[PDB]
Amino acid sequence: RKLALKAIDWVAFGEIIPRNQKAIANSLKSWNETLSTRLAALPEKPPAIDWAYYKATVAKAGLVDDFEKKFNALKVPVPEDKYTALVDAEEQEDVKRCAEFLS
């Protein structure tokens, strides 16, 4: 799970000055800080499972081997990012408006 590249939250982050949206920008900065803390909290992937040592330490028959088989067959999905694409499109429209204003 490689981290997505992002630009530094420079003074341009505070240069937005949205109408009644400075609190929104501060909340976004807090979200970024919390995301950085969460990323630093744990590694990219969870630790591996010592299936051999588990089976050696598992006296139960069937309830352990089938559990390991299910864990190997277990495949947790990943979330979607449709909102990311929508926000990117909105930012593109805002950039087009900014370009027209700049012209």
Binding site: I8, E33, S36
Partner: protein, 503 residues
């Protein structure tokens, strides 16, 4: 399997018999047994009774040998046979004790199996002399801003944690133990510190709570908890500091660095007083025997910083003294204050004044001084210490500070902000770079405009920001160990930006 392994154990055990030296119990009472016979017994030698209880032959009187009992005295009857082990009391030692809770004799009480100790070390070995030691230079980061800033502790220094009850001494020791996690699990060998917590005269529930706290913080894997609870006999409480000191001496001799925390040495002194009085040894001030300064002196002197010729190891001692009504002129507090290098003083008034930890920087001293600090921490701490001394000089006028001189009001504001910086939560040790960054942001006058009540929120937010976005600067400070001019400018820019954006 269980029956098979049990039979394997019993066949492995060999029931050998041999000659011994034995004596009869003339009189047993209050944990003191007067033994007839036993001519060839050394002083302070372990002897075992018929019932299985062990003992220590202290008084070698002509007619009888007075032995203290390592247990309840109901199991010793008049006429019982006291065998001679033939060796001075010694405790198991080594890396195998890490992660284990053991009694005063090293026996495991955590129910995690026998200790795989390969070496056996005595408890009354002499401390290293003048020549083997070296001056303390390496810091011993406790994780508390107040300690690492104003009362620094080096590796090989006896620093006292003195104060009344319910003031935070045990919390200071436990967060010092927790803080060493960042060094132990790392890679730098010369920074790892193995903690040894000795509990004296404390209920087993408290020790269990402490062990759970350490286990939740993943700090037990490098910590030894020697437990001599209040239920245990007085000799066990007397021996526990020496057992922990030997367990730390093992690390000290092998080039490793050990931290030993004698919790409630006053209770050990009480136990030794009980033993001495029951042995009819002549009493002294507060009924303590004459050799009570000797008891703590020959124990704390074993904390030392060996030179490179002897391995380069260390043993840092953190005795805990429970004063009564802040009376440091009492017998044991005076003894321990004289023996140790400095003390960390805690006050109930400061504890309930919002200054938690309750470290009284006016009374807390460190004779090793700034020599036990990193260059950056020393640089910020000199200024912070001078400014806090200036504030404490003018702290009397804070009640009527509105109608005062501009300089006095400036000093009051700076001191209030520094004091708010010194506050820290429990079980939350801070890295040295984080502490130096916070102290830099404070002493350089980046908080004077800020509201005094908002310092804590600002401190937490600034710590989160610097850890998240500016990790490179913190890493450079940690590796270099000093706040260089380029790092000074970078810190100035960062603190200015965060202060501007704080509102």
């Amino acid at each position: 399997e269980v029956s098979s392994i049990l039979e394997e154990r019993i066949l492995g055990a060999d029931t050998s018999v041999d000659l011994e030296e034995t004596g009869r119990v003339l009189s047993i009472g209050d944990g003191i047994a007067r033994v007839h016979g036993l001519r060839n017994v050394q002083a302070e030698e372990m002897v075992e009774f018929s019932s299985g209880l062990k003992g220590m032959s202290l008084n070698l009187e002509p007619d009888n040998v007075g032995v203290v009992v390592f247990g309840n005295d109901k199991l010793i009857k008049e006429g019982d046979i006291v065998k001679r082990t033939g060796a001075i009391v010694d405790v198991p030692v080594g890396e195998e004790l890490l992660g284990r809770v053991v009694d005063a004799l090293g026996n495991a009480i955590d129910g995690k199996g026998p200790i795989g100790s390969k070496t056996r070390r005595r408890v009354g070995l002499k401390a290293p002399g003048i020549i083997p030691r070296i001056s303390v230079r390496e810091p011993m980061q406790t994780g508390i801003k107040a300690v690492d800033s104003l009362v620094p502790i080096g590796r090989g220094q006896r620093e006292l944690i003195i104060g009344d009850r319910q003031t935070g001494k045990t919390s200071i020791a436990i967060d010092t133990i927790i803080n060493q996690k960042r060094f132990n699990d790392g890679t730098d060998e010369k920074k790892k510190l193995y903690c040894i917590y000795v509990a004296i005269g404390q209920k087993r529930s408290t020790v269990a709570q402490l062990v759970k706290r350490l286990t939740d913080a993943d700090a037990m894997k490098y910590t030894i908890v020697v437990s001599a609870t209040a239920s245990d006999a007085a000799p066990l409480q007397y021996l526990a500091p020496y057992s922990g000191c030997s367990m730390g001496e093992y690390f000290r001799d092998n080039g490793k660095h050990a931290l030993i925390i004698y919790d409630d040495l006053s209770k050990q002194a009480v136990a030794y007083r009980q033993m001495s009085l029951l042995l009819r040894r002549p009493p002294g001030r507060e009924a303590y025997p004459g050799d009570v300064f000797y008891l703590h002196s020959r124990l704390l002197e074993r904390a030392a910083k060996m030179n490179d010729a002897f391995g380069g190891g260390s043993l840092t001692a953190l005795p805990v003294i429970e004063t009564q009504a802040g009376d440091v002129s009492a017998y044991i507090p005076t003894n321990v204050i004289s023996i140790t290098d400095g003390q960390i003083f805690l006050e109930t008034e400061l504890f309930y004044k919002g200054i938690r930890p309750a470290i009284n920087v006016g009374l807390s001293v460190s004779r090793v001084g700034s020599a036990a600090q990193t260059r950056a921490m020393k640089q910020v701490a000199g200024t912070m210490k001078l400014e806090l001394a200036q504030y404490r000089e003018v702290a009397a006028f804070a009640q009527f500070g509105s109608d005062l001189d501009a300089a006095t009001q400036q000093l009051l504001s700076r001191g209030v902000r520094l004091t708010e910086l010194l506050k820290q939560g429990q079980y939350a040790p801070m890295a040295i770079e984080e502490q130096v960054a916070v102290i830099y942001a404070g002493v350089r006058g980046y908080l004077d405009k800020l509201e005094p009540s908002k310092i804590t929120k600002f401190e937490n937010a600034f710590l989160s920001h610097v850890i998240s976005q500016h990790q490179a600067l913190l890493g450079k400070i940690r590796a270099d160990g000093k706040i260089s001019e380029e790092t000074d400018a970078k810190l100035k820019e960062i603190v200015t930006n965060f202060l501007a954006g704080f509102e």
